């Protein structure tokens, strides 16, 4: 996260770290959506152009974390993966359309002050909150600058951007399964996701029911916190039929 701040303790209890077993390193972010299901970006797990193709046994899910590198004894919980499910129409060839994946844990994780699931939006949730100028929150242990790494989880709040502005900022083909967020140069304020943050959540707190909803997944950006560029997020509500289908069929 560039131009963010240290998270408070228990501020994002759905935050998940995807951790590579060897070498031991941060792979991506992710989020907890139930006691057995974790949501992330498909490209964190599968990206053929760079010969990225993880299997269940290659990584671990670390939940309840705050410090990036420390083993947080008695606080974090480390979980093994039973199965990975990538969206069947994930477009890794072109623009990362439908950049979403689920992973089922071998065993249910116990909820605590530090570990708790985020809500997923329904149609009216999305219609009411996914509006230009409304702010969401992005969190992660990614880099602090495009060109180092944080001691603890970082947080930044960023406004949703108008669709024509998103489209005009990039040469990538943008689809309805994406939305962009970030400040414009004239707005002065800064902030963005960066390397290591992909797969993590873009959340919003409904003013109607005072619950946190995961509206986006950190998907891609052209550099980090560049003027005139914006971060792109998977639109979780638009892919929720797929999410439900997978959880309903595989538990």
């Amino acid at each position: 996260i560039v131009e963010g701040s240290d998270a408070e303790i228990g501020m994002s209890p759905w935050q998940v770290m995807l951790f590579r077993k060897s070498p031991q390193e941060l792979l991506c972010g992710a989020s907890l959506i139930s006691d057995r299901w974790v949501l992330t970006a498909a490209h964190c797990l599968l990206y053929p152009p760079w010969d990225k193709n993880f299997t269940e046994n290659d990584l671990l899910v670390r939940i309840g974390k705050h410090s990036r590198t420390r083993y947080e004894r008695n606080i974090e919980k480390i979980s093994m993966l039973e199965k990975i499910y990538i969206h069947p129409r994930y477009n890794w060839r072109e623009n990362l359309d439908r950049d979403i994946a689920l992973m089922k844990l071998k065993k249910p994780v116990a909820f605590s002050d530090y570990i708790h699931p985020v809500c997923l939006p329904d149609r009216e949730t999305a219609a009411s909150l996914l509006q230009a100028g409304y702010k969401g929150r992005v969190t992660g242990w990614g880099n602090l600058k495009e060109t180092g790494q944080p001691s603890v989880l970082q947080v930044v709040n960023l406004p949703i951007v108008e669709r024509p502005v998103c489209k005009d900022s990039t040469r990538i083909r943008i689809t309805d399964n994406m939305f962009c967020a970030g400040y414009k140069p004239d707005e002065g304020k800064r902030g963005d996701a960066c390397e290591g943050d992909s797969g993590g959540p873009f959340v919003m707190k409904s003013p109607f029911n005072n619950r946190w909803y995961q509206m986006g997944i950190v998907s891609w950006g052209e550099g980090c916190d560049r003027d005139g560029k914006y971060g792109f997020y998977t639109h979780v509500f638009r892919l929720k039929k797929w999410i439900q289908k997978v959880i309903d069929q595989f538990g």
Binding site: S5, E8, I9, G10, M11, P13, S34, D35, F111, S112, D113, Y114, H116, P117, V118, C119, L129, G133, Y134, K135, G136, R137, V155, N157, P159, M204, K205, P207, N210, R211, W212, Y213
Partner: peptide
């Protein structure tokens, strides 16, 4: 989950984090 977006250290005990108000103020 019935509970779940309600954080144990914030919503569950009626405490607000340091920047959630920034989000609320953007929701017009």
């Amino acid at each position: 989950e019935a509970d779940c977006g309600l954080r144990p250290l914030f919503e569950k005990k009626s405490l607000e984090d340091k920047t959630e108000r920034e989000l609320l103020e953007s929701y017009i």
